[model samples]
Target chain A: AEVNDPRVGFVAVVTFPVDGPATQHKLVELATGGVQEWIREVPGFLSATYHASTDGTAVVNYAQWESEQAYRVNFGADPRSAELREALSSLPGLMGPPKAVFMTPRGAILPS
Target chain B: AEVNDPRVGFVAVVTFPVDGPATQHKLVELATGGVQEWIREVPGFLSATYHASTDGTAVVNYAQWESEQAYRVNFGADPRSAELREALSSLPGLMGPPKAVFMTPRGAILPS
Candidate 1:
């Protein structure tokens, strides 16, 4: 998960194929809302951000977590998120099931 | 450009379809090196992170910038970086030219 914060230690990059660029905002809103209502309650969850592709064919959600464990337990095991998952996938303009890729901090280059 | 930081104001999510999980690291090292060697010198460049999809089919580059104009002046126009750009695209097993999506800070959910 990626946000404008320093606490993030792990990120889940969720990519979605969309019908059009217009669908980008709609997808982001539902995703952001879903996290606000449900996932935010999970411990060690830091933040969630949705980026609409400049071309509108895709949507990417970068979520921040305090550690890898928080994401693993919730996304990899916990069944509590099924409802939100189902609802978001069924939303209009979505082309397919979203693919969530878990990531580690391989490396970074920051300003000096 | 997502990293463990608070200064990020803009993100460019660059996604790539890959050949396999093994290709992920090779792709990451190449990209991280490219930024460290080339793009890092551009002003407003904050950080660049390469995330390998756990399943091994994709590679994502989330680069953080201080503003939108910085990304545009370089990726969009500045021809000086073209050599690096051409090299990345032709790397082994890349499905096609990578697509870069410019993102704004639409929303975030943080610890209460």
Candidate 2:
């Protein structure tokens, strides 16, 4: 997602913890998602930037949405949402369920 | 930082858990930093976007840098880093120390 993109009013920062590097490798692949792209199945889908932590413990996603309402109204209701959760449960080395924090992009400090 | 910007080779995602909304408010102010931007005090600082979760439990900063080495050589060496940490300790309802995860801006899915 384009950080600081004015149009993006809502962000869903999701973090997934892994047991080790090999699992982190799988998490990265899971981020792009092979087929379903479940989060994308929702209406508000704006953009999502994926990350794999260097310490070999986690993967995080910075997902953007047009508005908080866009996410609130449709999140989890979609069939794909359930599909993704089931998929995540089966991931090897995954610590637990993904933690999603809904937030607003307050501001950014650009290089001077 | 520009998420897909070819220049930025490293990203630091720092998270702070809070006791409640009041604690989160303090975290946001801490993000821009009132006087000394400790993280910014280090060299190679590119950009940082601050966010406060809607649930009122956390604050996060997506900080970028020129290279991993640039961040590695000078991160905790700066005296200001200590100062900032001290300030965080005093924040009301702060759960504990901030958690930082190092990673690369692997990729992003833009609108289709």
Candidate 3:
């Protein structure tokens, strides 16, 4: 079991099919908008960041939450998350929900 | 809290500096040897993979373990790990130990 921490959570990686530049940018735009809303409304959301892979095949999303239950509940309530899902439907070969475990100040070490 | 699972665990991402082809290959060889040894001795090591960024700015290593404690113990006893560390002394901007949460059959989802 992970040590309970006040300021840590999961990371999700979403991979989109190799869409052309225009479609890729549009997908990213939709995702960004939806994520911005999620960060604003999701309870216990400490922080969220999105990174697009250099090859444009994947985007990694990181979010810190107070706890797992906090995230689950937020997902349960947010209809917009489903919208994000719908937007992703156009893209093929999506791979994801890879977890990210955030570092807590008390129980983590960062390389210098 | 994560549900206890026999097959799921954390992922460690280790980043190394961008090195020339020769140096990079040498580093990879060293790492591969050390890792193969580790996988042989360490209990609960599910899988590991190493990836280099397109621009060669970083190398990301992913290792899956049964639990956090198993990984910690393996690190404590592994002097070869320190040797790998010393080999990294010449490289600059090494970053990592990023947590990789593994997907378990019972409590995870992957996009199609």
lDDT of 3 by residue, B41-100 (tens): 566555444444434444544444566666666753577657656765644444433333
In model 2 chain A, which range of ten residues has the least summed lDDT? A33-42
Q: For model 3, how does the per-residue alpha-carbon lDDT over A18-58 read when each residue is reduced to its tens digit?
A: 34445445555655554345445566655443434434544
Number of the predicted model whose lDDT against the real structure is largest: 2
What is candidate 2's lDDT per residue for B9-101, written digit by digit as tens? 889888888998777777777757657555555678787788888888778888888888877677666677677778887888888888888
Error of 1 at B3 (Å): 7.1
Clashing residue pairs in candidate 3 (N, C-alpha, C atoms within 3 angstroms) = A11-A100, B11-B100
Which order, best to worst by TM-score?
A: 2, 1, 3
Of 1 and 2, which scores higher on lDDT? 2
Estimated TM-score per prediction? 0.74, 0.82, 0.41
Give me the overall lDDT of model 2: 0.76
Evaluate model 3: give its TM-score.
0.41
Model 2, which residues run further than 4 Å from truth?
A36-43, B37-42
Q: Which digits, one per residue and each the tens of the lDDT, describe model 1 over residues A1-112?
A: 4433456667897878999877888877877674446676788877776776666787877787878888877644667667667878898999989987776555565555
Which number leads on TM-score? Answer: 2
True contacts kept of each: 0.67, 0.74, 0.03
**Higher-ranked by DockQ: 1 or 2:** 2
**Residue A14 CA error for candidate 2 (Å)?**
1.8
Candidate 1 wrongly placed segments (more than 4 Å):
A1-10, A20-22, A34-38, A66-69, A75-79, B1-10, B16-23, B87-96
Better of 2 and 3 by DockQ: 2
